[PDB]
Ligand binder design. Structure first.
Ligand SMILES: CCCCCCCCCCCCCCCCCC(=O)OC[C@H](COP(=O)([O-])OCC(O)COP(=O)([O-])OC[C@@H](COC(=O)CCCCCCCCCCCCCCCCC)OC(=O)CCCCCCCCCCCCCCCCC)OC(=O)CCCCCCCCCCCCCCCCC
Ligand SMILES: CCCCCCCCCCCCCCCCCC(=O)OC[C@H](COP(=O)([O-])OCC(O)COP(=O)([O-])OC[C@@H](COC(=O)CCCCCCCCCCCCCCCCC)OC(=O)CCCCCCCCCCCCCCCCC)OC(=O)CCCCCCCCCCCCCCCCC
Ligand SMILES: CCCCCCCCCCCCCCCCCC(=O)OC[C@H](COP(=O)([O-])OCC(O)COP(=O)([O-])OC[C@@H](COC(=O)CCCCCCCCCCCCCCCCC)OC(=O)CCCCCCCCCCCCCCCCC)OC(=O)CCCCCCCCCCCCCCCCC
Ligand SMILES: CCCCCCCCCCCCCCCCCC(=O)OC[C@H](COP(=O)([O-])OCC(O)COP(=O)([O-])OC[C@@H](COC(=O)CCCCCCCCCCCCCCCCC)OC(=O)CCCCCCCCCCCCCCCCC)OC(=O)CCCCCCCCCCCCCCCCC
Ligand SMILES: CCCCCCCCCCCCCCCCCC(=O)OC[C@H](COP(=O)([O-])OCC(O)COP(=O)([O-])OC[C@@H](COC(=O)CCCCCCCCCCCCCCCCC)OC(=O)CCCCCCCCCCCCCCCCC)OC(=O)CCCCCCCCCCCCCCCCC
Ligand SMILES: COC1=C(OC)C(=O)C(C/C=C(\C)CC/C=C(\C)CC/C=C(\C)CC/C=C(\C)CC/C=C(\C)CC/C=C(/C)CC/C=C(\C)CCC=C(C)C)=C(C)C1=O
Ligand SMILES: CCCCCCCC/C=C\CCCCCCCC(=O)OC[C@H](COP(=O)(O)OCCN)OC(=O)CCCCCCC/C=C\CCCCCCCC
Lengths: 91, 77, 200, 123, 148, 55, 140, 74, 96, 50, 231, 55, 68
């Protein structure tokens, strides 16, 4: 009733252990952070496994089958034959 | 009226004081402050104009069973 | 309640000055007067009444006594600036509540937003053109005057009219679409051939 | 007051407090790796290094103007023009076989007078 | 306060007036309510509803250009799924009972019934062309109006 | 109302700030003429004209 | 009050004793200065940015629940569960796909995060001191 | 800087899920997010690491060529 | 290892279509637009519910108790309500 | 230009390296001092002219 | 107080206060066998048994989390019936609904059970919260009775029984101690008791027109700077 | 109050008119900065500051 | 129906302003002019307004210099 904390008439130790409604919200958020350890950990674990498949795919994309170059060297366009020779004459 | 004054002094015409104190703060309160979402010991106001129903006799037994004479009334009824 | 005092102080500020603790310096209301309100004359009458009650209706005492300004209004512009910086959306929201009770139509609201953003878009183009003139300056061309509204014998370009007709025919140049030719990637063929020559 | 002092420490580097107004100012050390990934571009060197002196015939050097007209490459992909947003859905991406050059115009060109870029506003 | 703030008043009654039309029995309001939002940025250009999207891209009418295509594809599929719902009898739902014993003859009459089924839809997009052509004609006259 | 003179200063300070900063302001005003005429003449009836005309 | 404020207290515990006990009440100016820089519960110490996130997180999440909670397009094909005539069943998975695409709103923000920026023209301007260059600078 | 931002933005999504774990996990109206959030995250991670890995490979191919070709010219 | 992972590439997407970088812009706008529309529809059912549940009753009809009004009456009564019931019972049913 | 919003005067010290040899924390030390002297110039003026 | 003045408030194109069959252009029309080749309809005669099985599931699946609380099972039953008796007692002519009210309500209740099967229905969470708040207060009374202490509720019952004797000991001219007098005696005790408690301000305005919030601190200014924590 | 939309149009029309007519509006803004600062900092006390400062 | 009494109200006020602008301005600003600011403020209005008009005239003259 009258022992309720007052921000003016407050002790240092009491403010350090206040634990008001603000902290009560945070403790509820922390309960979710902890419960998500396996869900988040499973994602990172898959990123670590997916990492090794990407390494081999990059080399497959850059070097190709026999180290002579893969699809990284391929470039395609939607220009017609007239559009290409128009751009050359434009140059 | 539709001619109340300049735009800067528009928030002046809103205050209506219940006392003879001068000067008067101009600000007119819009809402009631509700900083803490506290569970009100107050009972819900939905229980306002509900006609008699089954919940009336079920609660009567619960309150009657709290007395010796009420336990007799309920069992016999 | 329990956490009411600790919380209420956490949400809002109080006025720390004790300007009104001093009695004689208290203002009667003649410092900041409302001039246009319909109760203008009723306010002046209460000021006159307060000046008379303070002197037992012998206003010669007030003439000889010292007149003070309203010390309570000191540093008020700064205090509003600090609240605007602390929470500008909350300061704007509550300062515009009474004005936002009257909500114009969807058409008017869309015009405010459209014209306001269209004005900012042209300002952004004007900044980019100022950088073009600086590069032109550094490249060896001195510039008399400024802007692109050529007074002389030159072609102007005013800016895309912000109407659907021109917004369907024209669109601004996206710099991210100007690219290095992919033929650059064909120089990597040298690397694959060297790796095989060196036995890698 | 504390945040006013902290902002003073930052503004010694940031300069202008308003956004979209200017740039910060940081003096950095000079090393061989300054602009190391753009040494291949020539226009970047001229803009950074050379402050040219305007002449009586007040014009940009003809050589600089001539190089500037050699059109750059602009992507065909365009969802901002509704005709291309529809047409490019039925377009067939065919392989562009390298002919041994570094200037193959397999896309459109960044020139106002190009037949596939005339809708773009160059200002 | 939903009774003093005209912003929530306009939006609340407007939405109630939109959802109450489910009694018109078009289809699930939970399905086609999203298409209404897209169709609003097609015809809302007349009222500048696309204004808040001017900084979101280099094309102010981007969302309106996509919505018109969305509006066309999903309206083009509404008749197709309706026939899938009728089943193999779908031709009887349109034309009814045949008249001749020749299946080849009815085959031609049934094709016309299926084309008409779609022409009732596709033919209504010529109305949209009139709205645009008339909208362009006005922008041309105003943009070229005299000022000296 | 208590700081009209002060707010009037800072109001014009930023106007001059924007004007002193915006060197091509004439190019912006001219670029805004067409949409200003187009949108106001198109939306007039649905905002104001309806209150004295057809519907 | 939050843990970071409590951490400041243990570090500023002796400083609070000097300001609040000695300076805040000695006399004259040393009092006004100590009572102005007092240490305690923060007046108006709320963080609107934290609250702004909490509000927009909650409002955007209520939209995810609506957009993601739709009747299946696959189940409506058999005409045996809850759906005989659904002429707009092919719109069932548009909003869900639109919400899942929202997870890349910030991952792919701006042009630099959608491609290899050094192969784009705006990168040259940033390395040239945010300076205008001819459009063909990437070729020369 | 690009790879670090996209990594911090992906981490922001994991915080949004953690901060809202009870809703995504127990409310069935958010099941589609619970089911497909990790699929989208892996594809995002793949794009980040793919780009970083390809960039790293090209840098090494470039460094080893200028050194080999420099000796041949000497 | 398969070639399907090539879709993760954005450094060289300009070699195939250069379309992804532009389409997601619309998708981000489409989500934002729906977020404003749907959030308004689903949220703005509370004014109707708040009003009808407090003003739609009439004396010429019976107002029937809902689930919530049942739990609140039986399992959420305060002390004064408990006192008032027993106060009436002891005085009239027992002490007359 | 450090006090202007969206300045277009790119030639007025905007694209140049502009340092000084004054006290740092400019807005906390130097800029107030210029305003302090300003208040002195005007208070000494008012008292004199009045 | 205030009554709706518009006499046509409950008028619809279908009739007065019609919320069962609103008027729409595509109205129901009959079907004739001799002329009907095929038909696609979802209506059936399975709603009656689905209404029965739905009640049994919602009841049995919610009792999983009542922990054998018999008083809660009976209270929940009364609330569950109130949800199923809506079509039987509503003003709406549920038998004349457009396309079958029976199928409509059943499908609506099924969506509720889906949430109940996952223990995510708001009525479930509302029930757990309401019950825990009740048992905490009943345990506080039990602990005070086992200690021989008197509960706050008994102090009033005893304080009210004596106040009645004082009133009827002087009410000799008349002898009809109405329920109205008994009531205003208790309220006078509740207001006095409630005011004694340190409760948060519920009414907007106190005895004066001014609001009773922490924000209603106007001039004059008399508060100094805020003080720090004491060591 | 009955023609806020219409008067808003003509107001911005004459603003654009003056802005489209005034090609060196930037020269006018910069030439107005000094008198804006001088007269407001000099007359502040006699207009506004007197109500809270000194007299 | 609309309020046909407000028809052509903008045209009518325009003609009254042309007929007698000083009378139209005087009475439309009477209630506003009841609160008159100080001599200093009134002078600042006039000084800044006339100074802005003086610079506008110089910019018109500089344009004739650029045309020559
Ligand atoms: C005898 C005339 C002396 C004139 C001196 C020269 C000018 C003033 C210099 C000092 C500056 C402060 C001024 C304060 C008085 C204000 C007077 C005033 O403004 O008139 C208000 C007055 C009506 O307004 P009011 O609100 O009712 O007045 C009450 C006050 O507002 C408030 O009411 P109050 O009752 O509360 O105050 C009473 C009044 C009583 O005053 C007196 O009794 C006068 C005392 C004797 C004279 C002392 C000054 C002598 C100066 C000579 C030496 C000058 C050296 C300069 C260099 C060399 C010069 C050769 O003021 C005081 O009490 C003074 C106390 C000072 C407190 C000091 C506390 C410490 C502060 C430390 C920091 C100071 C920083 C200040 C910043 C710089 C100041 C601008 O107008 C008239 O009186 C009309 C008749 C004319 C009066 C005679 C002329 C006096 C000068 C006024 C200007 C006349 C203009 C005429 C044209 C009018 C427009 C067209
Ligand atoms: C089975 C039936 C069908 C089912 C329908 C279901 C409908 C569901 C409704 C759900 C409602 C959603 C609830 C949330 C709404 C909150 C957002 C809002 O805008 O409220 C404004 C809210 C309510 O506005 P209001 O003042 O009460 O006025 C409402 C009505 O106008 C009433 O006032 P009025 O009577 O004075 O208006 C007269 C009207 C008079 O209009 C007419 O008489 C004829 C109009 C013909 C238009 C001609 C179009 C020509 C197009 C030419 C196109 C050429 C270029 C095309 C280029 C394409 C590419 C080639 O003229 C107007 O002013 C119309 C208002 C503008 C509407 C724009 C959209 C029009 C298309 C409608 C699509 C739906 C069609 C349904 C079919 C109905 C068939 C009967 O007011 C506010 O300012 C507060 C919010 C402001 C936020 C502004 C931000 C806007 C953008 C974001 C909004 C949120 C996301 C997008 C939502 C979609 C918005 C378009
Ligand atoms: C570039 C191409 C552009 C074209 C785009 C078109 C795309 C269309 C997409 C639409 C969706 C298509 C997917 C179909 C799903 C089918 C699923 C399914 O199988 O369920 C069965 C389902 C039937 O089930 P039900 O109707 O619910 O109930 C059946 C009764 O219970 C049954 O009662 P019942 O037992 O009394 O009936 C007896 C029997 C009677 O059957 C007969 O009539 C008998 C026929 C004669 C058989 C030969 C007899 C030979 C006798 C030999 C005798 C030998 C004697 C030997 C003696 C022995 C000597 C020892 O009836 C049946 O059982 C058969 C009914 C099912 C036939 C399904 C036919 C589907 C053909 C589709 C082929 C193409 C699909 C391509 C998909 C591509 C997707 C990428 O099939 C359907 O419902 C068909 C509906 C499809 C309508 C789609 C219409 C869409 C518009 C298309 C044209 C639009 C043109 C305008 C274009 C405008 C631009 C947009
Ligand atoms: C086969 C070949 C064919 C060749 C010929 C083709 C021609 C086709 C003809 C068919 C088109 C007409 C259809 C009949 C319409 C019937 C509708 C009706 O019943 O009346 C509605 C309309 C309703 O007015 P109201 O109800 O009496 O009251 C109006 C309100 O109170 C509002 O008044 P307020 O006082 O409240 O102020 C607001 C007012 C005024 O607000 C303003 O401030 C606008 C002022 C505009 C004029 C000034 C512009 C500024 C530049 C000049 C400066 C002047 C002032 C300078 C002062 C001095 C400076 C020191 O706003 C208005 O704009 C009112 C206009 C009337 C409403 C119509 C909807 C307009 C929306 C679009 C607005 C943008 C267009 C503006 C057009 C001009 C309108 C006057 O009455 C009419 O105006 C009828 C006009 C029809 C006249 C037809 C005469 C014969 C035409 C044929 C002659 C030969 C032509 C040859 C042409 C050759 C090729 C070029
Ligand atoms: C025997 C004893 C002496 C008897 C003298 C006889 C007096 C006869 C009075 C005759 C009255 C004439 C009635 C007809 C005029 C009424 C209309 C009017 O405009 O009055 C203002 C009238 C009343 O204004 P108010 O708001 O009631 O304020 C009244 C007072 O200002 C009060 O305002 P406050 O209460 O707020 O007091 C604050 C005060 C505070 O002032 C102070 O505290 C001290 C002032 C120190 C001044 C320091 C000057 C430093 C100069 C430095 C410059 C250096 C550069 C030099 C260049 C040299 C180049 C080498 O500051 C001011 O008020 C500024 C007022 C401006 C006054 C300008 C004249 C100053 C010197 C006059 C000397 C006259 C000899 C008096 C000798 C007394 C000696 C004890 O304003 C209106 O509302 C009417 C419309 C005005 C429209 C604006 C345009 C008007 C201009 C045309 C007017 C007509 C033609 C010219 C007439 C003369 C005008 C100055
Ligand atoms: C998953 O589903 C989804 C939601 O959940 C329902 C959503 O809410 C939402 C909505 C999302 C939002 C409302 C969030 C929007 C956030 C936006 C727009 C950006 C926010 C930006 C800020 C708050 C400014 C941050 C500024 C910075 C980080 C710059 C300075 C650096 C700072 C402050 C950190 C220092 C950097 C580091 C790497 C060190 C990190 C330090 C720590 C981790 C210490 C932590 C300490 C403690 C005590 C926890 C979406 C879109 C969604 O998809
Ligand atoms: C009243 C109902 C019937 C319709 C009539 C209403 C329109 C009445 C027109 C009255 C105009 C009278 C004042 C016009 C004078 C100023 C314009 C002018 O003089 O013409 C300038 C010029 C022609 O000049 P020259 O060909 O070079 O001739 C040189 C001669 N030596 O013409 C113009 O500039 C066009 C006039 C300005 C157009 C302004 C556009 C205003 C937009 C109107 C939309 C209103 C939207 C309302 C919301």
């Amino acid at each position: 009733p009258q022992l309720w904390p007052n921000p003016n008439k407050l002790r240092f130790a009491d403010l350090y252990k206040y634990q008001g409604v603000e902290m009560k919200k945070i403790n509820d958020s922390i309960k979710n952070y902890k419960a998500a350890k396996f869900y988040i950990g499973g994602i990172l674990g898959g990123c670590l496994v997916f990492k090794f498949f990407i390494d081999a795919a990059v080399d497959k994309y850059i070097f190709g089958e026999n180290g002579n170059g893969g699809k990284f060297l391929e470039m395609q366009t939607i220009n017609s034959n007239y559009d290409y020779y128009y751009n050359r004459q434009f140059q | 009226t539709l001619q109340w004054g300049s735009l800067a002094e528009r928030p002046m015409v809103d205050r209506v004081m219940s006392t003879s104190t001068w000067p008067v703060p101009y600000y007119q309160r819009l809402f009631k402050a509700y900083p803490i979402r506290e569970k009100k010991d107050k009972m819900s106001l939905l229980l306002s104009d509900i006609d008699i129903d089954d919940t009336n006799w079920y609660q009567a037994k619960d309150f009657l069973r709290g007395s010796f004479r009420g336990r007799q009334i309920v069992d016999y009824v | 309640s329990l956490h009411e005092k600790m919380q209420t102080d956490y949400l809002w500020v109080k006025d720390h000055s004790q300007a009104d603790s001093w009695a004689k310096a208290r203002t009667h209301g003649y410092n900041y007067i409302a001039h246009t309100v319909p109760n203008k004359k009723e306010r002046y009458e209460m000021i006159w009444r307060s000046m008379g009650k303070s002197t037992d209706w012998e206003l010669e005492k007030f003439r000889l006594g010292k007149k003070f300004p309203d010390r309570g209004n000191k540093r008020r512009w700064f205090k509003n600036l600090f609240r605007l910086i602390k929470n500008p959306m909350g300061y704007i929201f509550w300062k515009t509540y009474k004005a936002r009770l009257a909500k114009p139509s969807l058409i008017v609201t869309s015009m405010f937003i459209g014209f306001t953003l269209g004005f900012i878009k042209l300002k952004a183009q004007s900044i980019a053109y100022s950088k073009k003139q600086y590069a032109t300056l550094r490249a060896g061309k001195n510039i008399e005057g400024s802007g692109q509204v050529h007074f002389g014998y030159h072609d102007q370009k005013w800016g895309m009219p912000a109407i659907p007709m021109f917004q369907l025919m024209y669109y601004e140049l996206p710099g991210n679409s100007i690219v290095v030719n992919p033929c650059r990637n064909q120089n990597y063929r040298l690397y694959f051939e060297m790796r095989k020559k060196l036995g890698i | 007051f504390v945040m006013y002092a902290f902002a003073a420490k930052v503004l010694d580097h940031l300069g202008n407090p308003f956004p979209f107004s200017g740039h910060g100012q940081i003096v950095a050390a000079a090393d061989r790796w300054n602009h190391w990934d753009v040494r291949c571009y020539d226009n970047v060197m001229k803009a950074l290094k050379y402050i040219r002196i305007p002449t009586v015939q007040n014009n940009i050097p003809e050589a600089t103007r001539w190089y500037g007209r050699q059109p750059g490459h602009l992507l065909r992909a365009d969802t901002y023009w509704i005709p291309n947003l529809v047409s490019q859905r039925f377009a067939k991406h065919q392989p562009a076989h390298w002919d041994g050059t570094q200037n193959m115009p397999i896309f459109r060109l960044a020139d106002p007078k190009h037949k596939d870029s005339y809708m773009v506003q160059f200002r | 306060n939903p009774n003093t703030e005209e912003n929530t008043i306009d939006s609340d009654y407007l939405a109630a007036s939109g959802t109450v039309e489910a009694e018109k029995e078009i289809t699930s309001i939970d399905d086609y309510l999203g298409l209404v939002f897209a169709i609003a940025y097609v015809f809302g250009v007349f009222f500048y509803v696309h204004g808040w999207t001017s900084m979101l891209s280099h094309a102010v009418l981007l969302l309106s250009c996509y919505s018109i295509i969305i509006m066309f594809l999903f309206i083009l599929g509404m008749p197709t799924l309706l026939l899938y719902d009728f089943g193999i009898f779908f031709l009887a739902y349109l034309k009814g009972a045949g008249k001749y014993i020749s299946s080849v003859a009815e085959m031609m009459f049934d094709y016309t019934a299926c084309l008409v089924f779609y022409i009732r839809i596709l033919a209504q997009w010529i109305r949209v062309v009139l709205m645009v052509v008339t909208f362009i004609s006005l922008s041309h006259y105003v943009s070229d109006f005299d000022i000296t | 109302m208590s700081r009209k003179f002060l707010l009037t200063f800072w109001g014009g300070f930023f106007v001059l700030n924007f004007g002193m900063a915006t060197v091509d302001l004439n190019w912006i005003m001219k670029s805004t003429y067409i949409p200003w005429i187009f949108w106001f003449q198109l939306m007039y009836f649905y905002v104001e004209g309806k209150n004295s005309m057809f519907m | 009050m939050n843990p970071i404020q409590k951490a400041w207290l243990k570090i500023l515990e002796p400083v609070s004793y000097v300001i609040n006990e000695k300076m805040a009440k000695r006399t004259g100016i040393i009092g006004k200065l100590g009572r102005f820089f007092a240490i305690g519960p923060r007046e108006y110490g709320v963080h609107p940015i934290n609250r702004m996130f909490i509000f927009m997180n909650r409002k955007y999440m209520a939209f995810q629940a609506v957009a993601l909670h739709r009747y299946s397009f696959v189940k409506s094909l058999t005409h045996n569960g809850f759906h005989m005539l659904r002429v707009f069943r092919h719109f069932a998975f548009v909003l869900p796909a639109t919400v899942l695409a929202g997870l890349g709103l910030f991952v792919y923000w701006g042009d630099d995060n959608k491609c290899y920026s050094p192969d784009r023209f705006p990168y040259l301007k940033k390395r040239a001191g945010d300076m205008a260059l001819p459009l063909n600078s990437l070729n020369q | 800087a690009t790879a670090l931002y996209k990594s911090s933005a992906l981490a922001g999504n994991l915080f949004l899920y953690a901060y809202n774990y009870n809703n995504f996990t127990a409310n069935i109206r958010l099941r589609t997010m619970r089911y497909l959030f990790p699929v989208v995250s892996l594809a995002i991670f793949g794009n980040i690491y793919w780009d970083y890995r390809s960039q790293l490979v090209k840098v090494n191919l470039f460094d080893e060529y200028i050194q080999a070709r420099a000796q041949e010219l000497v | 290892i398969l070639d399907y992972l090539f879709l993760l590439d954005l450094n060289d997407d300009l070699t195939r279509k250069a379309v992804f970088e532009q389409v997601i812009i619309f998708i981000f706008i489409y989500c934002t637009m729906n977020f404003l529309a749907w959030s308004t529809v689903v949220e703005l059912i509370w004014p109707t519910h708040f009003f009808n549940r407090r003003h739609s009753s009439s004396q010429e009809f019976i107002r029937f108790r809902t689930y919530t009004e049942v739990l609140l009456k039986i399992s959420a009564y305060n002390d004064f309500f408990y006192v008032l019931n027993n106060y009436y019972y002891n005085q009239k049913l027992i002490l007359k | 230009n450090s006090a202007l919003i969206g300045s277009e005067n790119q030639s007025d010290s905007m694209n140049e390296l502009n340092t000084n040899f004054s006290m740092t924390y400019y807005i906390l030390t130097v800029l107030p001092g210029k305003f302090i002297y300003w208040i002195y110039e005007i208070l000494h003026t008012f008292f004199v002219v009045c | 107080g205030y009554k709706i003045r518009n006499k046509s408030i409950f008028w619809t194109r279908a009739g007065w206060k019609n919320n069962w069959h609103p008027k729409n252009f595509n109205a129901p029309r009959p079907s004739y066998g001799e002329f009907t080749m095929g038909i696609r309809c979802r209506n059936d005669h399975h709603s009656f048994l689905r209404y029965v099985q739905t009640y049994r599931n919602m009841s049995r699946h919610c009792k999983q989390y009542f922990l054998g609380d018999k008083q809660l099972e009976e209270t929940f039953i009364l609330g569950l019936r109130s949800l199923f008796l809506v079509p039987y007692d509503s003003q709406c002519l549920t038998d004349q609904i457009k396309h079958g009210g029976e199928r409509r309500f059943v499908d609506q209740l099924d969506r509720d059970f889906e949430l109940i099967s996952y223990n995510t229905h708001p009525y479930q969470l509302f029930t757990y919260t309401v019950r825990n708040e009740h048992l905490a207060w009943k345990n506080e009374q039990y602990e005070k009775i086992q200690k021989g202490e008197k509960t706050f509720e008994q102090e009033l019952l005893d304080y009210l029984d004596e106040q009645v004797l004082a009133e009827k000991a002087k009410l000799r001219d008349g002898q009809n101690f109405s329920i109205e007098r008994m009531t205003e005696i208790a309220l006078h005790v509740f207001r006095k008791a409630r005011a004694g408690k340190v409760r948060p301000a519920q009414d907007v305005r106190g005895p004066d027109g001014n609001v009773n919030d922490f924000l209603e601190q106007r001039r004059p200014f008399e508060h100094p700077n805020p003080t720090g924590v004491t060591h």
